Amino acid sequence: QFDTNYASGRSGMVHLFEWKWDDIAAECENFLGPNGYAGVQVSPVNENAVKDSRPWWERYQPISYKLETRSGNEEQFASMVKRCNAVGVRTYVDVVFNHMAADGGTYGTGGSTASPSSKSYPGVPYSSLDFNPTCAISNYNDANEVRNCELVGLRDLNQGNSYVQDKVVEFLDHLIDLGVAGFRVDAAKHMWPADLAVIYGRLKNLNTDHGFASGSKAYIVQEVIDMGGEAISKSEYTGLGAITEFRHSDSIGKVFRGKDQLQYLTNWGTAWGFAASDRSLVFVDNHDNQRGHGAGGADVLTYKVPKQYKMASAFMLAHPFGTPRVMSSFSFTDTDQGPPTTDGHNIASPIFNSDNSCSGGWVCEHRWRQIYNMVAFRNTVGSDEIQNWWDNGSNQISFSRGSRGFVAFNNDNYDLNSSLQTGLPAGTYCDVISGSKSGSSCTGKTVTVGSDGRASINIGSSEDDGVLAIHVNAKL
Ligand SMILES: [Cl-]
Ligand SMILES: [Sr+2]
Ligand SMILES: [Sr+2]
């Protein structure tokens, strides 16, 4: 429940938010695999309610557990999981079993229907007996209300009923049979850990035909928003699996926006209120808070603030704490709008420019060189500890990961032009933020490390990027 089941030498779980299964399978073979990424978090794979204008959040209103969505059907999903596993990229499913669709959700994405007004969902065989008595959540200081009442009108399932446990376990086991590596448990805060323990403990072992070692169990990351001041703490879940560490997203946004100083990053980790490193999924933003949903912090950094977004992403990917998840978005100016479509309904596949960047309504942050090259950085440094920490007491910092990678940041309003200790072997390195190693040369900036380990590091405050990174797997 705690091991990611990543393949060897890989890091980074990309949330391919609202992507179709066929497009993910291609992306695994064309990009994610060859660029050392470790996994893909998919949108909910089960049938959801069809809502007017097809908002993104319609997928969090389950109608059945049949694998029929705007992303594809079961055959397309199964083929994607196989094709992704074959190139070393794992699949993690956003599973939604706190609730069923709310009132108005009559039609499902796979042809099923439902009567949420009567709590009747004939696709899951669900009836009103399978739900908690109707009430609304308002007081997050009442743990009983948070877990037993309806979240924004979504019909609240009773996971204490053995029939509901059976239906959920059957659904998750089915996904395991198809080769998934783990699950992102939606609204875990709104369910009782005792019931989740029963569901988690019943899941079968992972499918060894997809390359998982014998005895492997599903990775469990639980969506628990714990900013403090409420009745439910993330510590109620860290014994059953990992948790979504939203303090990381909030703090890293404040720090790299300039609301806090980079010099304080010297004790990044539990000293900032985070859960344990081996229990924390970290991210710069997620599909909720990039949109003002969920925690909804205005200091969250998104692709819309690109320079500081890449700096925070680079710091996350360079830092040993936690398990990083890399957001991948579609462009939006409305917090309800769904993914791009060809006709208002059919999701439009991403298209690619001459430089392999995304277009057609998709951002593909995972295809930004400053981000995927930092995945390569993370892969090169392994488990090496932070060394050679330096800062100017404000917003200029640098450090190495052992003797294998070095990173430097400038968030001050003046230039950084300093000889810094990199801890790396002497030689000529390609800055992987501004470019890549290509043959025996660099496409962007070059960094020369002398015999004493020091190098001239130059990051102008007005440059497009405010981070520089070098590592031994991009050395001339
Ligand atoms: Cl999440
Ligand atoms: Sr509940
Ligand atoms: Sr200091």
Residue spans per domain, the chain: 13-381
Q: Which experimental technique did the depositors report for determining this structure? A: X-ray
139 is in an annotated binding site: no
SS3 label, residue 437: strand
Q: How many residues does the chain have?
A: 476
Instruction: Return the bridge partners of 197, or none.
Output: none
Which residue's entry shows tokens 């430089």? 355
- Backbone conformation region of residue 179, classed left if phi is above 0, alpha if psi is from -120 to 50, else beta: left
Q: Which ligand has the nearest atom to the CA of 289?
A: 1
User: Per the structure block, which two tokens stand in for 201?
Assistant: 């403990």
Distance 131 CA to ligand 2 centre (A): 9
Note whether 126 and 156 are within 8 A (CB).
no
Q: Is residue 29 annotated as part of the catalytic site, yes or no? A: no
Tell me the structure's resolution in angstroms, rounded to a single decimal: 2.0
Q: At what angle do helices 306-318 and 369-381 cross, to 10 degrees?
A: 10
Three-class DSSP category at 447: strand
Q: In whole angstroms, give the CA distance from residue 227 to residue 214.
A: 37
Neighbours of ion ligand 1 (CB under 5 A): 223, 244, 286
Determine whether the annotation assigns residue 158 to a binding site.
Answer: no
Q: Which of 28, 45, 212, 48 is nearest to 121 (CA)?
A: 48
Interval between CA 393 and ligand 3 midpoint (Å)? 5
Q: How many whole angstroms separate alpha carbon 365 and alpha carbon 397?
A: 24
Active site includes 142? Answer: no
54 is in an annotated binding site: no
The catalytically annotated residue of 47, 68, 130, 186 is 186
Fold of 13-381: TIM Barrel (3.20.20)
With b for 16 or more beta-carbon neighbours within 10 A and e for fewer, the 429-438 pattern comes to bbbbbbbbbe
Rounded distance from Cα 223 to ligand 1 centre (Å): 5
- For residue 372, give Cα distances in angstroms to 10, 123, 286, 319: 12, 41, 17, 15
Question: How far from the centroid of its chain's Cα atoms is residue 61's Cα?
Answer: 20
Return the residue matching tokens 């569901």. 199
184 marked among binding-site residues: yes
**Of 23, 150, 195, 223, which one is the catalytic site residue?**
223
Residue 94's nearest CA partner among 13, 30, 154 is: 13
Q: Quickly list DSSP for 152-186.
A: TT-EEB-TTSHHHHHHHHHHHHHHHHTT--EEEET
Identify the nearest ligand to the CA of 264 by its number. 3
Is 190 labelled a binding residue?
yes
* Cβ atoms < 10 Å from Cβ of 427: 15
